C-alpha cells in the first residue's frame, strides 16, 4: 500500500505582529476529513491545536482556525503574535501509517 | 474533563552501540491500550513507529518493540544503532485532547 503523502506550503514564513498568516496542506489521496494540526515550540513536545479539520481544542486562542475537506486543508492565524513562533504540522489519520507534512517554521520580522 | 497527562522517563539517556535501551511512559488514567510511539530526528517531522501499544509499522526495524496496557507502557530498542539517535515520544489517544509525553533524547556515548 503506498503511504499517503502530505504536502505542506510554505516551508517557512516570516511576518509582522498583527498580520494574517495561512498554511496549506494537500494529501495525495482523499482523506475525507481526518486531518489534525499541531504546534511544536523548540525543545518541546507537539501540542494538538485542531482536530478533524476544524475542531478547536480547549485552551487554544480563537485566532487559530482550520478548514477544508477531501484532499485540501488550510490553517489560519488571524493576527500573528509573538508567542506563536513555532513549527506547525498537519497529520492525516485516515490510514496507517499516519503521516505528517514536512512542517512550516513561523518567525516574526 | 481533566486532560490525560503522560509521564515519560528518562528525559535523556546516553548509551553505547549494541546496548539495550528502554523508555517508559505512564498515563494519569487508564488508556486501555491506546498509545502510539514516534521518532523525531532534528529538523524533521515525527515518524510513527508503533500503533496501539505493540503494532510495528512498515519500514521500521525489528529491533524496536512496544508493550504494556492500562496506565504503563514500555518502548524497547534491543540493540542500539547510530541511526537511532533521535528524540522519542509517546502519545495517548483515548481522550481529546491527545497528549504527548515530554520526550526522551537519545545519544551515543
Shape annotation of chain A: globular
Helical region count of chain A? 0
Query: SS-based structural class of chain A?
Result: mainly beta
As a whole number of angstroms, the C-alpha radius of gyration of chain A is 13 Å
Could you name the CATH homologous superfamily of chain A?
Answer: Immunoglobulins
Judging by the overall fold, what is the CATH architecture of chain A?
Answer: Sandwich
CATH topology descriptor of chain A: Immunoglobulin-like
Q: How can the largest sheet of chain A be summarized? A: 6 strands, mixed
Strand portion of chain A, in percent?
over 45%
Describe the structure.
Chains A, B: Residues 91-97 are annotated as: Complementarity-determining-3. Chains A, B: Disulfide bonds join 25-90. Chains A, B: This is Immunoglobulin kappa variable 1D-33. 2 copies of one chain form a homodimer. With 109 residues, chain A is an all-beta fold. Chain A has a single domain (1-109), classed as Immunoglobulin-like, CATH 2.60.40. Chain A is built from no helices and 10 strands. A 6-stranded mixed sheet of chain A has the order 2-10-9-4-5-6, with no helix packed on it. The first copy, chain A, has a 4-stranded antiparallel sheet with strand order 1-3-8-7, with no helix packed on it. In chain A, a hairpin with a 2-residue loop joins β7 and β8. The termini of chain A are far apart.
Amino acid at each position: 500500500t503506498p503511504d499517503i503523502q502530505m504536502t505542506q506550503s510554505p516551508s517557512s514564513l516570516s511576518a509582522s505582529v498583527g498580520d494574517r498568516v495561512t498554511i496549506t496542506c494537500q494529501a495525495s489521496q482523499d482523506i475525507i476529513k481526518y486531518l489534525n494540526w499541531y504546534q511544536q515550540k523548540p525543545g518541546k513536545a507537539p501540542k494538538l491545536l485542531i482536530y478533524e479539520a476544524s475542531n478547536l481544542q480547549a485552551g487554544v486562542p480563537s485566532r487559530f482556525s482550520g478548514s477544508g475537506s477531501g484532499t485540501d486543508y488550510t490553517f489560519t492565524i488571524s493576527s500573528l503574535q509573538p508567542e506563536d513562533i513555532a513549527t506547525y504540522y498537519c497529520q492525516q489519520y485516515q490510514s496507517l501509517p499516519y503521516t505528517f507534512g514536512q512542517g512550516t517554521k513561523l518567525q516574526i520580522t
